[PDB]
Amino acid sequence: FGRFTERAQKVLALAQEEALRLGHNNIGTEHILLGLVREGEGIAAKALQALGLGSEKIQKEVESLIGRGQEMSQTIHYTPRAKKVIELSMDEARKLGHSYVGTEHILLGLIREGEGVAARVLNNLGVSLNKARQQVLQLLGSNETGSSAAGTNSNANTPTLDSLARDLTAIAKEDSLDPVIGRSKEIQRVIEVLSRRTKNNPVLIGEPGVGKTAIAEGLAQQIINNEVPEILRDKRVMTLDMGTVVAGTKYRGEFEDRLKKVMDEIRQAGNIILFIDELHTLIGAGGAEGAIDASNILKPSLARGELQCIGATTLDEYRKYIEKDAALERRFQPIQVDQPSVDESIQILQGLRDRYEAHHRVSITDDAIEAAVKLSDRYISDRFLPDKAIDLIDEAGSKVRLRSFTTPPNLKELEQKLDEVRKEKDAAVQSQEFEKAASLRDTEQRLREQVEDTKKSWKEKQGQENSEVTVDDIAMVVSSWTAQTETDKLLNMENILHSRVIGQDEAVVAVAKAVRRARAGLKDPKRPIGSFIFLGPTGVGKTELARALAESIFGDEESMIRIDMSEYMEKHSTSRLVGSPPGYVGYDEGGQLTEKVRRKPYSVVLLDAIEKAHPDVFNILLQVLEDGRLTDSKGRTVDFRNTILIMTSNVGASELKRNKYVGFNVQDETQNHKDMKDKVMGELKRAFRPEFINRIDEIIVFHSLEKKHLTEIVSLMSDQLTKRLKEQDLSIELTDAAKAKVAEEGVDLEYGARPLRRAIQKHVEDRLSEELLRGNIHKGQHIVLDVEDGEFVVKTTA
Amino acid sequence: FGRFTERAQKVLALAQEEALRLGHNNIGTEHILLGLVREGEGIAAKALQALGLGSEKIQKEVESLIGRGQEMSQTIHYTPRAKKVIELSMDEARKLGHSYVGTEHILLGLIREGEGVAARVLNNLGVSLNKARQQVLQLLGSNETGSSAAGTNSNANTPTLDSLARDLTAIAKEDSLDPVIGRSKEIQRVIEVLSRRTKNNPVLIGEPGVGKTAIAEGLAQQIINNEVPEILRDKRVMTLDMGTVVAGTKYRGEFEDRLKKVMDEIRQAGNIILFIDELHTLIGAGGAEGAIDASNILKPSLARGELQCIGATTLDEYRKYIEKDAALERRFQPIQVDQPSVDESIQILQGLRDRYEAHHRVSITDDAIEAAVKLSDRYISDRFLPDKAIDLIDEAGSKVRLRSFTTPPNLKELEQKLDEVRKEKDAAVQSQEFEKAASLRDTEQRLREQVEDTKKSWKEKQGQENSEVTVDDIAMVVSSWTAQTETDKLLNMENILHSRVIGQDEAVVAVAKAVRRARAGLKDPKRPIGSFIFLGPTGVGKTELARALAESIFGDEESMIRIDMSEYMEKHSTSRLVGSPPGYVGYDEGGQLTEKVRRKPYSVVLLDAIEKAHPDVFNILLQVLEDGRLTDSKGRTVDFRNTILIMTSNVGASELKRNKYVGFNVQDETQNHKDMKDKVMGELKRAFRPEFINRIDEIIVFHSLEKKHLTEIVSLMSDQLTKRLKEQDLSIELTDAAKAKVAEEGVDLEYGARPLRRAIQKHVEDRLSEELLRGNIHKGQHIVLDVEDGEFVVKTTA
């Protein structure tokens, strides 16, 4: 554990004085012993003086064992023996108070490490080693706060409060408690409803997801001082813990027996407050199974005010309590939960940012703290806005703390050398090769001493990271989940989406820019990072872009969902038939869509061809587009304020018969585009509401594959070919001449850039394999697929 | 005993010396004893000098029990007692630490195997036998690395680290650790995410499927030494294990109580790292079922950093924890796991070849290794890309290592002789045949000495097989699953597919070649062996070829799935049974179809008559055609990379149904061909999808069964008939004249090779049976069914 009290360190440094003063090159146990008694007072030092051991008396013994008798003081850092005394002391302070380890613990630790020169000194100077450790103990008590006895009461309260367990107030009368950052507005509202008698019970609703106990510590504090009335005469607050009751049992019946007994003992009523966490599980009400039905006991308890209690339930949970009556709905009555505003969130963080010093990197930096919150709300994007935050500070608060090790100036090399030596050295003694190991050894220890010397030059490795908490660090971690690894993604988004889509560049820059809005925090944090409709034929660049987004935004291509909407018609069921009549709204809500998006929450959701689905599906999607939520299966709210929703649509292809082609003019791209983009725009509305499209952030337009995009998609695919065969040692290339001939297959009025994959199969995969069987090609020869006669021709060029 | 230490062997060879040196023909226990003490100062030898038993003292006793005078030393190999002492020492090396087998064990093993002449030597020379076995032990009875006492302690760390559980650091401090070739990028990505103080929990998601523990051994070492953030101050690494908890219990409640208890002791927080293996089981909730909801305790534990932990999760698990929140959403965070790239895979293998030298059939050959990976990757294809390989190395590194001792050059025959004698010999004395056993013994034992002599002449067959691990070797093991037994299959593929199907030979060579392409590489490793559609009127050769593929490639005639798509079209099969829509895709995806293909991996999947299946069926097939995966039941991804998909159809039926003649025309067939290759192949596209046909690797056209093929199919079938009756001893033949007459049923314009079975049935089975019953023909005589008047006549022949 880092950072201790002086008294420990002080005894240690006194060893170092003895290091040189007796000259022992590695500061032995003899010097440590002298160190303890030379710190004079402080229980370790003091202890030795009690048993009759002066610093003198010790040193007389010490010099008779190693003497002077060294004065070189070579590499005067400790012995491993002495290093053990320190490891032990740390633990003798774990053992005895001190997290910030002190001297006392060090003599205690010494006794533990009763070895060699130390040990023999005291047992020669008529003091048993444990007589010394004893001595420390019997003066010790270490560290204490808010504790010391002198008198307590007994009252009717005695049987009850034991069991079962806990009291926020107790630990706060021995304080370390934090508010924790309000979470203010609940706390008043409970005490009115608590100092009630015919609804003696408050009921807190909402925010789970707030760290309920933070509000509770709020309550604790406020129930003490001083708004409480004589309508709360001598009220004391004890917290329900499910864990102690369930522990030590193996049947439901045993828990209930204990619970029955407890409900009886709460009879100290009119003086007791019970806090009941997770109240719903215990009520057991309604549905298929509300769980354990403690409610039966609970209901009269609540009514009596014996269980004058505070119930912690949630949005849906309340149903399973108001359903019970008339001593569970005649118990409940609700009051409204709160938590730190988005900026306030930031501030909570800051407060224990600096208190990360047991955690370095962070301490500090506000802009970074702010980054933690702000960047997160949109980048995963489903938690609480301060909880998210501190983790980013801290991740980055280590990532960067890590970045020290490799880059101080790159003084990682010192250690590297010391490695190379050790090896040489060691192995040289093992063959021996003695004086030939010797010099390697000398080379080793040259290096070694340098390492430990420069390791406290690597307080620069603290000075690098331990306040560079800055924005960027934080951003990298938020992107890790999903400045630093987010703004290269932002600035170059079109370029990056372009680097995996060359199927419709128009589309790439458009999607890029919308993503850059959201990804820079310029959109609602209650709407997805993108809603889109992609008009045109299937996979013109469409499908490829969904992929390219995963790739660009998250750095993870493996964060892309993909569901075909043409299968979820709901009412285009035979009106645009796709052979799937039953289920459909039940299929998306009831499990499929919703389960999938829960897996990766920042997933490019690719809803293929939404033209073939009726305007009704779009209402479900609308909840994403508005709320940034979907409300579905097993009472989940899946926050779609994350994700990239990308809906492609056959709103193009079906009508489409004009070609967005550069080869028939540039005026053939953008006015055939416009021609389909008009016939599209009435099919757009017919398949997915205008209301839908009104809450869809952007309408991305593609149309049948361009001149120009094909041979670039093909030249990537042919290159995927050239790369996947090279790893296992085969060089293939399709020249530009061959990538061109392959590309011609998709041009289209209705297809897209889908057939390109096949034309790569036929002209590359298939073509190479019929050449390997032939004996045209060989291992690692470059196999050129070129066009020379309007057909592929295989040349060898290696 | 496995190249297991000299000291054993060393004491032993001195026995052989003593064997002849006093004249013992089987080296008795007296010579073994001498061997020990004449080996001077090994543990065995040394011990005896302690017991007072000098080599002299021993030998004096020894010569007085046997001593003289079998100086001829007939064969001198051991006495069976002495062979036991050696067998015992191996166990005595288990017993007294030594992986290898050395001296202590031999004296201890000797005492253990006290026996006659040895035993009497020490008990005559005033030495108790157990005093001796003691004596060896108490000098050496150990071999040690790492561990060895010297005393160290820590305090608060005690209750936690005790419980529960395994410590990777411990085995790495005692150090028997092997890296084992990581899987590096995880370790960094864990340590940012670990060295937090809020989401201080890493969560590893990846292929499991690499051996998660490789990353773990990665972590272990790197968290200790030596560049790690200050957040991770004075860390200790403890791995958790469910297995010890569940053992010795049989009720859930105790396991949970213990989990609560553990959660408490981890309070050494900010100084402890917990590794939670099999994290999923604990997390529970989600889906329709949990997994054990320890999560309740675990979630705050993770947030607190007391259970600052590393979670080793799965595909699905992340969903059911970020769904839980917010000490499970702001706790968890994923990072991407590595595996050794396909070429790298090869290298991992290679690395453990040399250590497969106690397996003595690796190292070598490189080409075999390279192959090990590569041949498996494309076929079988039942595993991930690196695992397959090493298994082949070792398999074949035993198949052939067996071929060592199966044949010497074929000098196995020597031993065979010794046997034949022994039998005769023994039994001859048991009846006796006194001297009539003599010569048999002499012939036997002649053989015997020669046998044991030639068994170490069969170090030559070891130098033959026992390091080789060949391409051929590897191939053979891959064939065992399914070079050597793959390339005869490859080279002759058309011929072999031809040998079971003659029906449209045009089709056979094509199909053959497509398999040979994939099966000889240069196709995506993810993609299937072949996607195809085979058109032609029902079973032209189509079905039969699917069979022939199974037959040829796998060595099993059938290992071929077979589904009729017309029953679950996704088109018209909505309401074939039921009056309402529920059905068709639900069977296909939902389990039925997919489970069947899941059973055999290398399986020709035959989806019959897809002619009027919806475009939807094709999308499902398409996932195979593109990715080479199918997405189905229990959230499993079945990697279609060994399936051979063959979909048959009569989609534009009429045009297919115009023969590929030959025996009628030879040029109307190649004009039916082009014609069926458009109206059919476009109805194919119209009922399927053009995208479907476009990612189908090859569309094979079979016409109606050639006029031509029939008497050759008939000559397989009619002969298959003649062969199935021969097994229980009946010889039937249909002459060429009668096989010609059988072929006549279908000659075809609208039908396949289906009516041929029926016509064999009529013309062979039915025809023989009405003649066997009437006594024209009988058992064990040859039944000629001939034509000699344009109709069958049953003739009799020898």
Side-chain angles (χ1 to χ4, degrees), chain B residues 318-324 326-327 333-337:
Chain B
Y318 181 34
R319 193 276 304 179
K320 51 190 293 294
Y321 198 46
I322 196 161
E323 175 185 64
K324 301 198 72 169
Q333 184 267 357
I335 58 263
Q336 324 307 116
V337 188

Side-chain angles (χ1 to χ4, degrees), chain A residues 2-3 94 357-358 360 383 387 391 395 397-398 461 578 724 728 745 751 754 757-758 765, chain B residues 154-155 192 195-196 198-199 227 230-231 233 268 271 326 343 523-524 527 616 691 694-695:
Chain A
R3 297 187 301 283
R94 289 303 193 228
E357 25 74 277
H360 283 146
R383 344 185 196 287
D387 202 348
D391 339 308
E395 203 249 55
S398 28
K461 286 192 183 165
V578 202
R724 69 185 189 77
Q728 307 314 112
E745 193 171 296
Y751 208 159
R754 302 306 308 123
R757 185 52 180 158
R758 174 54 30 188
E765 312 192 6
Chain B
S154 292
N155 194 86
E192 31 165 51
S195 187
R196 310 209 200 191
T198 317
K199 276 175 165 203
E227 293 282 58
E230 192 269 359
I231 309 82
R233 44 158 56 170
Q268 256 295 106
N271 307 86
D343 211 74
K523 291 297 298 179
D524 310 290
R527 284 194 188 220
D616 310 313
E691 175 68 346
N694 197 239
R695 213 65 81 270

